[PDB]
Amino acid sequence: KLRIIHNGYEGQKRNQCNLMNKYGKLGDKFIVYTSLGVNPNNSSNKLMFYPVYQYSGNTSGLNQGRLLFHRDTTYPSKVEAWIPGAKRSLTNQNAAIGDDYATDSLNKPDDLKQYIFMTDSKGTATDVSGPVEINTAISPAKVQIIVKAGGKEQTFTADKDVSIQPSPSFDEMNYQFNALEIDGSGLNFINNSASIDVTFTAFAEDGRKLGYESFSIPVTLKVSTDNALTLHHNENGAQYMQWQSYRTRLNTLFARQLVARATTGIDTILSMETQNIQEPQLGKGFYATFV
């Protein structure tokens, strides 16, 4: 199930995505201004406006474009968006608290892809720069899921593998796929374990990436050519575990032979002849010296 949200990064980008959600549908096109800074000459605080321009004539049926904004000021004021390059002003007398718009009196969006000076003439000034035209429509042919399970990448798009396409929304779009076919032959089993890397991603109409989300499905293979772990108790007192070729001692017979070293005293317990107390061999075998 692939899920897409349209919000991001609470400073300076959440307030711009709330304007697209509140005043627009998903198939709309917008201008997102990615560079916002205060004017050091005309501002008395560090607050700023967050502008998004909405086009005229899209999924949201709109006769005339409008400049959305969001202000953090609670006092009533006008909001004026002065454009020095086009000598045009978009002014909203008595702006609302938070989300409001100022309609574009003559539909020329190319006069808005440049420097805009937004102010309220009561403390707030903003150098609006860096326009980015985005298209927020999403076709399901570009929403794909990449499955790299061992050998070859397998890509499953949402135009063929979804039974019911959901409604377009900025909040949630749940893309529930069908039962997808993954060729598990050819996995690289390192230490008897493999993985299936499932990567969710989605693209918009203007080619921008909508983010990604990578998963991993661990696959563990059961070998059958090995022997089971075996616990032994040899008659010399040595207990060990038989992992297939090795013998690993479990107990110790140190405390059995410590008793003869403990009759004299602690000077005899904490010597080195006590530290040279030997332990029996692990089952059938021998000692070999390799030079």
Binding site: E10, G11, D72, T74, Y75, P76, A96, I97, G98, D99
Partner: protein
């Protein structure tokens, strides 16, 4: 008892406006406390922009000044005795009102 429950809901709804409109909370970005911004509009239009005017502690115009306790005292205690009585509050003390 339905009038008591509606009176408690009026205290909570007016509180939720005045809590989240705090400039002490709006400067702290990391709290992620959402301003109302849709029912804050209807509150400020009705009450002449009350939720934008906050005051410092120690002033007279506060909700918790001693002038605010004197107002609730005088509102309730002025009806303890009848209006034609000698023990009426505005009869014994005409300078309080």
């Amino acid at each position: 008892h339905d009038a008591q429950q509606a009176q408690k809901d009026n205290r909570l709804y007016e509180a939720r406006i005045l809590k989240r409109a705090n400039p002490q909370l709006q400067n702290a970005v990391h709290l992620a406390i959402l301003a109302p911004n849709a029912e804050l509009i209807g509150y400020n239009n009705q009450f002449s922009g009350r939720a934008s005017q906050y005051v410092a502690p120690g002033t007279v115009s506060s909700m918790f000044s001693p002038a605010a306790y004197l107002t609730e005292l005088y509102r309730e205690a002025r009806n303890l005795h009848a209006s034609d009585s000698v023990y009426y509050l505005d009869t014994r003390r005409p300078d309080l009102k």
